[PDB]
Amino acid sequence: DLQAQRHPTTGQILGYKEVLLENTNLSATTSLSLRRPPGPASQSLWGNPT
């Protein structure tokens, strides 16, 4: 992801360093957590199987 860095006090962007993502291989139709990708697209609010 190339995440930002933060000064330990009054956090300021020292530099951008790459780290490993951890909640990939997670999907909207096979996972029930608030970490999954948002959704297919703008979509019908209700009435959605799968």
Partner: protein, 182 residues
């Protein structure tokens, strides 16, 4: 330093339901909460002041009042707090005809209020969506990505649980609600 270093370092070393009293406690509503999220043209009564005192800490009230015009002060202070925090709030009414004038009054009182019902879908992107409970029950079974931004769910008339053909909706909703939603 050797002696001064030491001379400095030696000196250097369950109930689950709280029946808050109706009348007695509150005496000081303005010392704390000096910037209320909403300001009326009159004085909020004692029990409404206590309810606001507990809504500040993000607790979960159960108002049970007499007059229909006393509860909506809490019901719009929660929306003022929601707009202050940038989050979203869902006000849910059972009657299809009751959720029209409530919509009118909430759009007139402040900013953006979307409405969702069986046929109306005015602005389904606002921060005070007004719906019928069967629509919240239908978008709890799927994700619908609105649940990601909620703070408050204002069940308006929760004494319809005693109904014979719709009392199961209120309990399917009260069960499926995630934990971060007061």
């Amino acid at each position: 330093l050797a002696r001064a270093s030491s001379l400095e370092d030696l000196v250097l070393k369950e109930q689950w339901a709280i029946p808050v009293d109706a009348t007695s406690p509150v005496g000081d509503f303005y010392r704390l909460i000096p910037q209320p999220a909403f300001q009326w043209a009159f004085e909020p009564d004692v029990f409404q002041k206590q309810a606001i005192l507990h809504l500040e800490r993000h607790d979960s009230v159960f108002v049970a009042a007499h007059t229909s015009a006393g509860k909506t002060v809490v019901a719009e202070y929660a929306i003022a707090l929601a707009q202050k925090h940038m989050t979203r709030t869902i006000y849910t009414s059972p009657i299809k005809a009751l959720s029209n004038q409530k919509f009118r009054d909430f759009r007139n009182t402040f900013g953006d209020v979307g409405l969702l019902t069986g046929d109306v879908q005015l602005h389904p992107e606002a921060s005070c969506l007004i719906m019928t409970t069967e629509i919240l029950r239908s978008m709890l079974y799927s994700g619908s990505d609105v649940i990601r931004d909620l703070e408050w769910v204002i069940f308006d008339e929760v004494h319809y649980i005693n109904d014979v053909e719709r009392g199961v909706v209120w309990e399917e909703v009260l069960i499926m609600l995630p934990d971060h939603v007061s």
